[PDB]
Design a protein around this ligand. Structure first.
Ligand SMILES: [Zn+2]
Length: 891
């Protein structure tokens, strides 16, 4: 029925791009509109400038003042370095001008040359025409900046203003009689932004001067917002000292101001299809399978122009502003609808050489997504991100209420619902306390769109939305073209607080929400049933301080591969063998889980606090993304950390990487030298557990006892035996240097503790105890607790350096280990080439323990401790006591 022309016109009002498919049509309209704006700008600027001097130097002590909506705001003065030093506003049908410094008191000094242009700008403010004289004694209200100095400035520019002698900012009758309001940052008013806007809308011209030099100003920001302008970033003009030179021409300033925050060349390119056919892709590089193209000539400049558009639209997304409910946003509306229209046409996969036109146009459209609206369109093809299930997910007509717990002060947490593609969702938050909140969609890192890899432009570049700010008790309506996992983004929260999320129009992905310390068997059954229905492409799991955001087919693949399709057993292992294993090893205070009897008892014997939230609360969330692609490689560090293989509760990588989140500097030998070592206790512990509890032998050659021994025996023969071992074991700075040999130091203490306790099952408690000890060392009141912690001799809390040249880690390890074992461990530290400070050595001497003579635990397997052998290193070095497993040695 309706033509595309008709669909476009209605879409411009409503934001409803559902039926809009002709991108070329929208693009012609955008071209006309961008040309309207350039014509309107250039006539205004040309009228302002004429052949007057363009010289304007605001100095280092000044601020940049930027436009926002390109249809109604624009630069006035752009320096040679491209910084906007003053801007013009026609917002709300008004007239305003804003400068980054108080130019009015410089019109007889540094900026005498600017005075004639300033007079034309005032004529434009007062009369709407830069060549129309002001009346003699025209009434000017000056508020928030020195009145006499401002009025004298205007006089020295050849104007004849008279003091209005009333306040046109705060008094609406004064406004109606006044010809101009001049504002500075000393102003007082109720609802300053709205008040400025009201005056502007009513037809009072406004001239703002920034009065705080290179300092930012909240009052300044609020005035600018009322004008529809933007305070520049921190530091102002302090570094660049940008200025407009005397040599600047009318033509050039008209061109720069007409072009600012506009891209007619891009719009033409779109309209004509003139996408670049000859990028030199040979200049792309690849790194562990990911191709990037930063050095392809021309490409960065193009990508940065597309970033401008993305940044301009995302500024509205972030503040929860609906462009279609804001008057005079036509250019931006047209960009948004153009990109929605492209999205009806996208087809995957694309390749950077084979499909230059579709690839480049998509590259642009993907950058332009308006989330805050009452209606919109789904992208037709979701490629490697999702498919028909995501597209068809049902949504709730009624409002659902969700209670979320924030585990730390800052981060994000899964809400447990999705936006469905093209479907309006409404959301709000209540009972936030002092937490600052936003909503976001999806968790993908941008490297997981592999668009520069051959034929892998197969999903949107920006699956994760901007963070959309929320206010207590105010609803926001969203439509996403992709659908997505809703996240609650938070800062300034109180660990353990809750937030109430009310949402209407959301879909319900399979979501497993383990309730801390409560029975979960119903939640699991409900999750399994949701998976069985197979109505989603994405699922989430929240289990303790871990949240998993996962493509269903990837998780299904892991369950099918390693669990024979048994979703229950997979979940149990994920919760227990993976997650709980790690958090319990690190000794955190886990709801409704007591410490084991041996840990309980040792904590009482040491008289320690091993249970308070104050000291041992669970840390903030570690997120895991499971997807077809990762930020880097086939999996990548971070938070979230990314992986593409699935999700393996028994995996080495999963626990190694979780282990990074749980590292602490005071348990690292030589700082960064243990940056890939001290986290290894997590996967090692898990493998020890897996071999015992399941009979499966994983990664059984990780701990290189044999070569650690070789290096120790060779090193200790040197004149300085500690330095000799240090050189051989800890000196190499390579990321995974001597990884297996350094790990063997960490396990020494496990075998020692098992022997000391006379219980082969207790060995790993030493690491849980050191963790407990360290968090007290880190946060307990020093004078009151140092004796219990074995730090009696220290006037102050030790340092927390992670540097390889620091002894902070070595020292605390030496003290914790000596104190817990109740033996002086200096001789085994020396054996391993590990130096400690004089302070720490004195503390160990203070304990008055018997030395533990140097010792070394040797094994020819990592996971099976029953064969470990204890070597006395105190008088010499015995021969390595093992053959190699399943090996034929030389006769
Ligand atoms: Zn690592």
């Amino acid at each position: 029925m309706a033509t595309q022309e008709e669909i476009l016109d209605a879409a411009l009002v409503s934001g409803d791009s559902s039926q809009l498919t002709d991108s070329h049509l929208v693009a012609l309209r955008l071209q006309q509109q961008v040309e309207r704006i350039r014509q309107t700008r250039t006539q205004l600027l040309d009228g302002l400038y004429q052949n007057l001097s363009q010289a304007y130097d605001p100095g280092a002590a000044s601020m940049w003042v930027l436009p926002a909506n390109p249809d109604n705001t624009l630069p006035f003065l752009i320096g040679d370095k491209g910084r906007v030093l003053a801007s013009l506003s026609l917002e709300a049908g008004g007239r305003g001008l804003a400068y980054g410094t108080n130019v009015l008191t410089q019109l007889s000094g540094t900026n005498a040359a600017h005075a004639p242009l300033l007079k034309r700008a005032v004529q434009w403010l007062v009369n709407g025409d830069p060549g129309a004289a002001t009346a003699k004694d025209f009434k000017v209200s000056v508020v928030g900046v020195d009145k006499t100095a401002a009025l004298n400035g205007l006089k020295s520019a050849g104007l004849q203003p008279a003091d209005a002698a009333c306040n046109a900012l705060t008094d609406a009758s004064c406004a109606s009689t006044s010809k101009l309001l001049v504002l500075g940052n000393g102003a007082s008013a109720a609802s300053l932004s709205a008040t400025v806007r009201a005056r502007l809308q009513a037809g009072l011209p406004i001239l703002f001067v920034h009065t705080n030099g290179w300092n930012q100003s909240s009052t300044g920001q609020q005035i600018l917002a009322g004008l529809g302008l933007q305070e520049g970033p921190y530091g102002g003009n302090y570094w660049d000292k940008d200025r407009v030179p005397s040599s600047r021409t009318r033509t050039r300033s008209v061109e720069l101001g007409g072009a600012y925050g506009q891209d007619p060349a891009l719009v033409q390119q779109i309209v004509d299809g003139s996408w670049r056919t000859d990028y030199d892709w040979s200049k792309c590089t690849s790194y562990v399978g990911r191709t990037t193209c930063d050095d392809v000539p021309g490409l960065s400049d193009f990508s940065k122009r597309v970033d401008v558009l993305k940044g301009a639209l995302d500024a509205y997304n972030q503040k929860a502003q609906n462009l279609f409910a804001l008057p005079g946003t036509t250019s931006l509306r047209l960009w948004l609808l153009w990109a929605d229209a492209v999205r009806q046409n996208i087809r995957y996969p694309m390749d950077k050489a084979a499909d230059t036109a579709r690839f480049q146009e998509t590259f642009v459209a993907d950058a332009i997504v308006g989330y805050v609206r009452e209606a919109g369109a789904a992208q037709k093809e979701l490629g490697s991100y999702a498919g028909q299930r995501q597209q068809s997910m049902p949504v709730s007509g009624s409002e659902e209420t969700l209670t979320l717990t924030l585990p730390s002060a800052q981060g994000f947490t899964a809400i447990g619902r999705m936006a469905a593609p093209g479907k309006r969702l409404s959301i709000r938050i209540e009972d936030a306390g002092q937490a600052s909140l936003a909503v976001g969609l999806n968790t993908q890192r941008i490297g997981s769109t592999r668009l520069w890899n051959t034929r892998q432009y197969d999903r949107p570049r920006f699956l994760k939305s901007p963070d959309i700010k929320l206010q207590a008790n105010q609803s926001v309506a969203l439509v996403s073209p992709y659908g997505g996992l809703l996240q609650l983004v938070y800062s300034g929260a109180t660990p353990g607080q809750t937030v109430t999320v009310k949402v209407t129009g959301a879909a319900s992905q399979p979501f497993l929400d383990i309730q801390p310390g409560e029975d979960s068997s119903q939640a699991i059954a409900d999750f399994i049933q949701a998976l069985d229905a197979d109505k989603a492409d994405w699922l989430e799991i929240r289990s303790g301080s871990v949240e998993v955001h996962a493509k269903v087919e990837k998780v299904r693949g892991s369950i099918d591969k390693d669990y024979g399709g048994d979703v229950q057993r997979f979940i149990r292992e994920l919760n227990e063998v993976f997650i709980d294993d790690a958090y319990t090893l690190a000794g955190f205070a886990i709801p409704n889980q007591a410490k084991t009897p041996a840990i309980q008892q040792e904590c009482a014997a040491r008289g320690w606090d091993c249970d308070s939230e104050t000291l041992h609360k669970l840390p903030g969330t570690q997120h895991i993304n499971v997807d077809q692609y990762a930020q880097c490689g086939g999996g990548c560090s971070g938070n979230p950390y990314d992986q593409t293989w699935g999700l393996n509760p028994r995996g080495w990588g999963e626990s190694h990487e979780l282990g990074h989140n749980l590292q602490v500097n005071r348990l690292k030998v030589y700082g960064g030298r243990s940056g890939e070592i001290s986290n290894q206790i997590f996967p090692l512990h898990k493998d020890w557990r897996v071999l015992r509890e399941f009979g499966q032998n994983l990664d059984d050659t990780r701990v290189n006892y044999r070569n650690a021994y070789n290096l120790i025996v060779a090193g200790r023969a040197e004149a300085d035996p500690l330095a000799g071992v240090n050189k051989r074991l800890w000196e190499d700075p390579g990321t995974y240097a001597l990884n297996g040999e350094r790990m063997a130091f960490y396990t020494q203490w496990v075998h020692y503790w098992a022997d000391l306790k006379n219980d082969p099952l207790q060995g790993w408690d030493i690491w849980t105890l050191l963790y407990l000890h360290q968090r007290q060392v880190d946060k307990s009141d020093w004078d009151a607790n140092k004796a219990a912690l074995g730090y009696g001799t220290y006037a102050q809390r030790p340092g927390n350096s992670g540097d390889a040249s620091s002894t902070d880690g070595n020292d605390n390890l030496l003290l914790g280990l000596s104190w817990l074992t109740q033996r002086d461990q200096r001789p085994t530290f020396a054996l391993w080439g590990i130096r400690t400070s004089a302070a720490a050595q004195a503390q160990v001497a203070a304990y008055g323990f018997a030395e533990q003579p140097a010792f070394f635990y040797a094994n020819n397997r990592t996971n099976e401790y029953s064969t470990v052998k204890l070597l006395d290193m105190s008088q010499g070095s015995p021969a390595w006591p093992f053959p190699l497993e399943h090996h034929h040695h030389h006769h």
